[PDB]
Amino acid sequence: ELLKPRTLADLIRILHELFAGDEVNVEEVQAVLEAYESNPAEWALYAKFDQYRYTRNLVDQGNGKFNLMILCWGEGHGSSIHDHTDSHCFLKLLQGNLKETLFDWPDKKSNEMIKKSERTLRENQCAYINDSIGLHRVENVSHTEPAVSLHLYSPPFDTCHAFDQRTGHKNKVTMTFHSKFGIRTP
Ligand SMILES: N[C@@H](CSOO)C(=O)O
Ligand SMILES: [Fe+2]
């Protein structure tokens, strides 16, 4: 039974229930993420920005079933084109807007990766990606508004691949957390 999360803490409690089993009902998880109305006071602890690039700030470890984290995107900050290591990946906007660009898995032949589509993700909207859908890049293209997003990955993963847009070539990358549970972790 899916109820509206009243607060971020409530959302977390609901997620623990939804991930208590061995599978994941994606539509249910997306619906609950979308239903949480971003309240900046509740996540200010985690919203730690860096001048030069976006930051990943761990919020909850899901009793081992998922990682929930907050990403903070300065003006003009964006990601690489990347995959999600055979995991579910949900993204919900807490502040600002992000541009998501979708790409196909490259062929073994060296070629320009062409975008399959783009969309603008707006405050409170929750998107979903997985490797069967394709790859993506996420970017804050704003010149005037920082963005903040809430991401859930299940199972948790700390490595993925970045793809070169000009060739499709992939390189393994290890993601790092800027902070964990509100504490900066250099
Ligand atoms: N995959 C990127 C964020 S775009 O992923 O929804 C990351 O976790 O750093
Ligand atoms: Fe991503």
Swiss-Prot record:
| Induction profile | By increase of sulfur amino acid intake.
Q: Which leading EC class covers this enzyme?
A: oxidoreductase
- GO CC aspect terms: cytosol
Disulfide connectivity for this sequence is: none
**Keywords in alphabetical order:** Dioxygenase, Iron, Metal-binding, Oxidoreductase, Thioether bond
The entry's comment on post-translational modification says:
The thioether cross-link between Cys-89 and Tyr-153 plays a structural role through stabilizing the Fe(2+) ion, and prevents the production of highly damaging free hydroxyl radicals by holding the oxygen radical via hydroxyl hydrogen.
From the UniProt record, list the reaction(s) this protein catalyses: L-cysteine + O2 = 3-sulfino-L-alanine + H(+)
- What does the entry comment about cofactor binding? Binds 1 Fe cation per subunit. Ni(2+) and Zn(2+) can be used to a lesser extent.
Keyword Transmembrane in annotation: no
Q: What is its EC number?
A: 1.13.11.20
Q: Which InterPro entries match?
A: CDO_1 (IPR010300), RmlC-like_jellyroll (IPR014710), RmlC_Cupin_sf (IPR011051)
Positions of crosslink type 3'-(S-cysteinyl)-tyrosine (Cys-Tyr)? 89-153
Per the record, the similarity remark reads: Belongs to the cysteine dioxygenase family.
Per the entry, what this protein does is: Catalyzes the oxidation of cysteine to cysteine sulfinic acid with addition of molecular dioxygen.
Q: By what name is this protein known?
A: Cysteine dioxygenase type 1
Top-level taxonomy: Eukaryota, Metazoa, Chordata, Craniata, Vertebrata
The primary gene name is: Cdo1
